[PDB]
């Protein structure tokens with residue numbers, strides 16, 4: 095198919111994320127290749143090379159077509175593509191479970207593989223519900239979070255997404271009614287934690303778990319946060335006997351400057367979800383980890399098992415590439431790499447603070463954000479960034495980047511320059 | 524890792540589908556390779572080659588490591604592993620969407636890609652609910668199905684699963700309460716359809732959709748029903764203004780003797796789900812298709828968009844292998860292939876009808892089932908099958924197979940002989 099034909103098929107037949115059919119203001123751009131930090135896109139019938147400043151929605155931490163990950167895929171493909179995980183086990187699943195147990199916050203000793211972030215969140219909730227049921231406390235069935243969060247698109251996951259961001263107002267009666275604390279502030283305020291505790295106290299007997307994104311809230315608004323809040327959550331949860339679940343699907347694997355965002359506080363949750371960057375952005379894969387205590391209590395419960403099992407559970411191909419991606423990250427000085435990326439984002443984005451339409455500039459590890467005083471028009475921002483050799487996709491009022499870890503200092507400066515120019519145009523209406 | 528080390532890691536750290544940690548009656552068997560119709564498994568420390576009679580949970584329709592599918596994946600790997608589907612489109616997505624629209628029942632014109640069957644079911648439900656909200660009828664938010672079904676493991680999907688199979692007993696006060704008709708019979712009885720209609724009629728004002736597996740109910744009991752029941756559901760749904768959703772995640776791509784099981788009835792659903800065999804068993808991928816009417820009504824409603832978007836939506840690697848898998852199926856006389864498989868299953872399983880423990884023997888396309896009068900002991904059945912060079916996994920009172928389409932007459936004889944002997948050992952108490 096030519097790029098023209100691809101566009102024709104797409105407009106007529108393909109849904110896109112959170113999109114319409116036939117009512118798109120901006121046509122999608124045809125991608126024809128991806129290598130390292132670079133995408134080959136079609137612009138006016140001509141292929142142009144642009145920086146993947148988004149890491150393809152936070153996935154491509156090592157860039158595209160990395161030799162180590164390509165080779166991991168083809169070497170597994172040669173021996174075993176997939177086998178059912180019902181009654182069978184295999185080396186890729188075992189290697190990956192061993193790695194994940196050994197690098198995640200202490201105490202996370204068991205691993206449930208699934209195929210997506212949203213599914214891993216449902217699995218986490220199921221673990222929490224079956225746990226309390228295993229303790230003879232089935233009243234503990236509700237979830238508590240703070241506002242500003244995002245946890246995926248399946249119906250249980252939706253129920254803990256920010257009620258404003260997730261337009262819950264049109265899911266009246268269908269969504270489970272969960273407990274929401276106010277938006278967690280950037281700076282540490284003991285008063286916020288005390289109020290969080292006071293609210294949790296009113297619901298403790300009906301709460302299975304607190305579920306939050308640690309340190310960085312991604313899709314909900316790129317808000318950062320103080321890690322000390324996570325210390326308070328762990329204390330509150332311990333004292334009131336509510337499970338703590340960390341959703342690290344966004345973040346995990348070095349993105350925030352620590353290996354996992356929980357590490358910024360030294361906090362272990364009871365259950366943890368990982369996903370986006372798990373395979374280095376090659377293949378869909380997610381994981382839900384829980385403590386030995388949670389696993390044993392579930393296993394000793396009425397069901398005698400966790401009542402979940404996806405078709406492609408622990409897929410050998412996805413597990414093999416993930417093994418390679420995790421080893422590639424751990425086999426280098428990733429901490430210094432992320433610190434350098436963060437330095438580059440900070441230096442490059444400082445000039446945006448002076449721009450008329452800019453309300454905030456913030457950086458946390460390999461995440462850089464320009465917050466604007468108005469929603470960013472994609473019809474202007476997209477071509478503007480492409481003209482500067484960078485693929486950016488703002489959402490709401492945010493011009494942001496989460497670049498691949500392999501981006502050179504020069505490439506980071508190219509990214510921040512494009513971000514600044516988009517922010518300048520926003521004020522130019 | 525050696526098979527012994529794999530077993531050690533697995534016992535300590537890996538959840539399996541619907542499994543415990545630390546309370547497994549039988550250890551899983553280590554799989555070390557897969558090629559064509561055969562798995563290489565470790566038994567008594569040594570590798571043995573056995574037939575994958577289950578197609579690795581319905582997935583491996585062309586067998587493992589098919590050269591055409593390996594090639595397709597490797598070719599895509601060299602150009603573009605993955606890009607984000609937010610604001611970008613690509614050739615693998617377009618090619619697959621085009622194919623799927625062209626081969627599915629008439630009227631299914633739009634394709635929403637996701638990363639598993641359970642998610643595609645949630646997407647289907649979301650389409651149905653947003654559809655009625657777009658028509659100004661937000662009361663139409665419940666689902667109706669018949670008993671014996673299975674639709675996945677996420678919380679909304681669970682709500683339409685068979686109440687017994689799904690142990691809904693221990694999910695009281697958590698699952699949405701849906702409308703269940705009685706188990707659909709094998710043989711066609713107009714009285715059943717009339718009763719289904721009467722039940723639907725009293726709930727029509729609050730029903731968004733009927734959701735069923737067409738012709739074959741897989742995981743809920745390997746039960747077959749007359750295709751004419753689906754003709755009746757299409758009629759009932761039309762007259763009472765309730766959407767019809769067919770979940771073809773297990774039945775799709777030739778398994779039942781038609782390209783899609785809906786084709787047995789000559790009927791089109793409003794929404795359709797596909798999954799397990801979509802990639803030929805290489806990678807997790809699923810799709811939810813809907814009519815132009817459904818897509819337009821959603822897109823004109825208050826959200827102005829379908830509120831869903833998985834991270835790995837329309838993954839180029841998965842879409843590439845899927846295109847190859849479908850073209851491989853369409854490029855041969857698949858209908859004759861399934862007919863020969865069905866014939867082989869019938870002939871091989873006939874001797875079981877006379878066994879003392881056997882209540883039924885039934886075949887539908889490349890699906891063969893021996894139903895027993897008591898549960899099948901896996902501790903006895905698994906080694907018995909392995910001794911005969913066959914991987915079988917019974918569940919409940921069912922010894923069954925859904926073999927790869929590439930299985931030779933000799934391999935089908937080997938599969939069925941193993942199944943018959945498992946059934947024989949059941950009657951020995």
Ligand SMILES: O=C(Nc1ccc2snnc2c1)N1CCN(c2ccccc2)CC1
Nearest residue numbers: 111112255259260313607608609832833834
């Ligand atoms: O456009 C997206 N997400 C999105 C999802 C998947 C992909 S894949 N490639 N790009 C994507 C963008 N949104 C997800 C987060 N959103 C949200 C939902 C509930 C609460 C807060 C934010 C709405 C918009």
Ligand SMILES: O=C(Nc1ccc2snnc2c1)N1CCN(c2ccccc2)CC1
Nearest residue numbers: 178179180403404405540684685688689742
């Ligand atoms: O064990 C499974 N699924 C399963 C089995 C084997 C494999 S191999 N890879 N994935 C698998 C999933 N189920 C248990 C009972 N099931 C069920 C049936 C009816 C209603 C609710 C669940 C279907 C899923």
Ligand SMILES: *Cc1c(COP(=O)(O)O)cnc(C)c1O
Nearest residue numbers: 210211212245246343344833834
């Ligand atoms: C993206 C995301 C999810 C959902 O992941 P999918 O793979 O899109 O289902 C869940 N939680 C968080 C924190 C995320 O960033």
Ligand SMILES: *Cc1c(COP(=O)(O)O)cnc(C)c1O
Nearest residue numbers: 404405639640641674675772773
């Ligand atoms: C297996 C199955 C599902 C769920 O698919 P997963 O990929 O396991 O989430 C849904 N519907 C039907 C009919 C199935 O057989």
